[PDB]
Amino acid sequence: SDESRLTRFLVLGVDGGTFYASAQKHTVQATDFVRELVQRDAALALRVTLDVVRGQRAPKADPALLVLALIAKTAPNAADRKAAWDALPEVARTGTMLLHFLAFADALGGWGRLTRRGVANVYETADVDKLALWAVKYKARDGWSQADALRKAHPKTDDAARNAVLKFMVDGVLPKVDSPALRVIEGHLKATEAQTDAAAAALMQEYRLPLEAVPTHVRGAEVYRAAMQTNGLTWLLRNLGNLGRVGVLTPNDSATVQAVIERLTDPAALKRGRIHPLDALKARLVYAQGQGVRGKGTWLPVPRVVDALEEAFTLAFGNVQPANTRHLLALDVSGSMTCGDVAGVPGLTPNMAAAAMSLIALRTEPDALTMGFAEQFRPLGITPRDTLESAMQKAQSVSFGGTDCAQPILWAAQERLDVDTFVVYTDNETWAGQVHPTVALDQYAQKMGRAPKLIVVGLTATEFSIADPQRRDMLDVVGFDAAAPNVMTAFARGEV
Ligand SMILES: [Ca+2]
């Protein structure tokens, strides 16, 4: 079905059953099916695309932006090209997304009337606050800048304030209406000219300015101190190291320490911020290193903060959106599972990641059973009562067998176990058995009267292929990242 095949491309960013959960290239490129579909039925291409954007299941806007460009620029009909343009303001939510859309479109046609108007409509529809934000935060994206687009599109609004910010976005010259939209602009201007951690701090204090506005050279204690009070939990999670470094968060400075602990374990803030347990696990591991990636400095991890992150992990389970399907999780339990940094997270071993995901399933899905490719294929005996640490150990066995992704499915049919979703967790070592998982899945359907799905996760994989591109019941997840769990859940629910 065109609808289903296009939706899959829109979510995964590929025209097959593979999610590159990444930190690699895999930039979305339009395949033949996608172009052919846009010519054949641009109207449904567009309806499908809006459905996906609104449904918000796509980890990335990229594929929807590309598809939208294709329709807008190359759809045979004028009503379709026009409808695509009319949707641009919705789909290109941020300044970056608009510049990204233009990078896709510029390879499909020049600046005809539809294009000038369509781009102009984006700026003319945005309020003075969104415009000001774009003016300071989304100035450029590689080749394309807001200035470029504005010179080609020439937007004009009814109100002088917005025209003033549009003018500023082109010529960088500061006016002075006010609408405190200019305020944030003036603030960002002065911020670039700081030289001192204190003036910078005093500046975002005066001007409600983001930590972004502060030159890397001057972001000291007062700058980070200031940033905390003005950001949510997600920010806080990825900034613990930056706080240990700039001398704000230290083992002998209890007031800030307690205040961080309270935010990290605030159930209401966890829920509203939609913190996934892996988000908390990543923050803990990153923070506990006391040293960052290239060119970062060091810091002294505060133990009780590390502790609070362990609590945030447990509390976050309550906010996971379940597939609501019966899962059988088959874990690779061999020694190499203890090696590697999944998703570039220092210390996040495939074994740790798989144990975390097992606990999640056990605690949130209608049913879940965990098996392992051990001496023989057997239950690991992990339960919702386990900790991350005890589950990790149950998922390690000195004697192991090949990681055969067909085998959990063959086993379940043999045991007449009702399973909706099979999930295999490995590092990068799928091993082919005598029966392919496709045959396995067919045999299960034939014996049990239901067609289940299979997800194979290569937690540190760069490339493998198990999922049949011609089937819909299979998904390969290559690598891992923060978007992977939601994609897997969406897939299991039949939405991908
Ligand atoms: Ca292995």
Curated annotation (Swiss-Prot):
<keyword id="KW-0963">Cytoplasm</keyword>
<feature type="binding site">
    <location>
        <position position="334"/>
    </location>
    <ligand>
        <name>a divalent metal cation</name>
    </ligand>
</feature>
<keyword id="KW-0687">Ribonucleoprotein</keyword>
<feature type="binding site">
    <location>
        <position position="403"/>
    </location>
    <ligand>
        <name>a divalent metal cation</name>
    </ligand>
</feature>
<comment type="subunit">
    <text>Forms oligomers upon binding DrY RNA, The multimers are of an average size of 700 kDa and are composed of around 12 molecules of Rsr-DrY RNA.</text>
</comment>
<dbReference type="Pfam" id="PF05731">
    <property type="entry name" value="TROVE"/>
</dbReference>
<dbReference type="GO" id="GO:0003723">
    <property type="term" value="F:RNA binding"/>
</dbReference>
<comment type="function">
    <text>Binds to several small RNAs that accumulate during recovery from UV irradiation. Contributes to the resistance of D.radiodurans to ultraviolet irradiation.</text>
</comment>
<dbReference type="InterPro" id="IPR040322">
    <property type="entry name" value="TROVE2"/>
</dbReference>
<feature type="region of interest" description="RNA-binding">
    <location>
        <begin position="93"/>
        <end position="239"/>
    </location>
</feature>
<keyword id="KW-0479">Metal-binding</keyword>
<feature type="region of interest" description="VWFA-like domain">
    <location>
        <begin position="317"/>
        <end position="496"/>
    </location>
</feature>
<protein>
    <recommendedName>
        <fullName>RNA-binding protein RO60</fullName>
    </recommendedName>
</protein>
<comment type="similarity">
    <text>Belongs to the Ro 60 kDa family.</text>
</comment>
<dbReference type="InterPro" id="IPR036465">
    <property type="entry name" value="vWFA_dom_sf"/>
</dbReference>
<dbReference type="GO" id="GO:0005737">
    <property type="term" value="C:cytoplasm"/>
</dbReference>
<dbReference type="InterPro" id="IPR053680">
    <property type="entry name" value="Ro_60_kDa"/>
</dbReference>
<dbReference type="GO" id="GO:1990904">
    <property type="term" value="C:ribonucleoprotein complex"/>
</dbReference>
<keyword id="KW-0694">RNA-binding</keyword>
<dbReference type="InterPro" id="IPR008858">
    <property type="entry name" value="TROVE_dom"/>
</dbReference>
<feature type="binding site">
    <location>
        <position position="336"/>
    </location>
    <ligand>
        <name>a divalent metal cation</name>
    </ligand>
</feature>
<dbReference type="InterPro" id="IPR037214">
    <property type="entry name" value="TROVE_dom_sf"/>
</dbReference>
<feature type="domain" description="TROVE">
    <location>
        <begin position="1"/>
        <end position="325"/>
    </location>
</feature>
<dbReference type="InterPro" id="IPR056800">
    <property type="entry name" value="vWA_Ro60"/>
</dbReference>
<dbReference type="GO" id="GO:0046872">
    <property type="term" value="F:metal ion binding"/>
</dbReference>
<dbReference type="Pfam" id="PF25045">
    <property type="entry name" value="vWA_Ro60"/>
</dbReference>
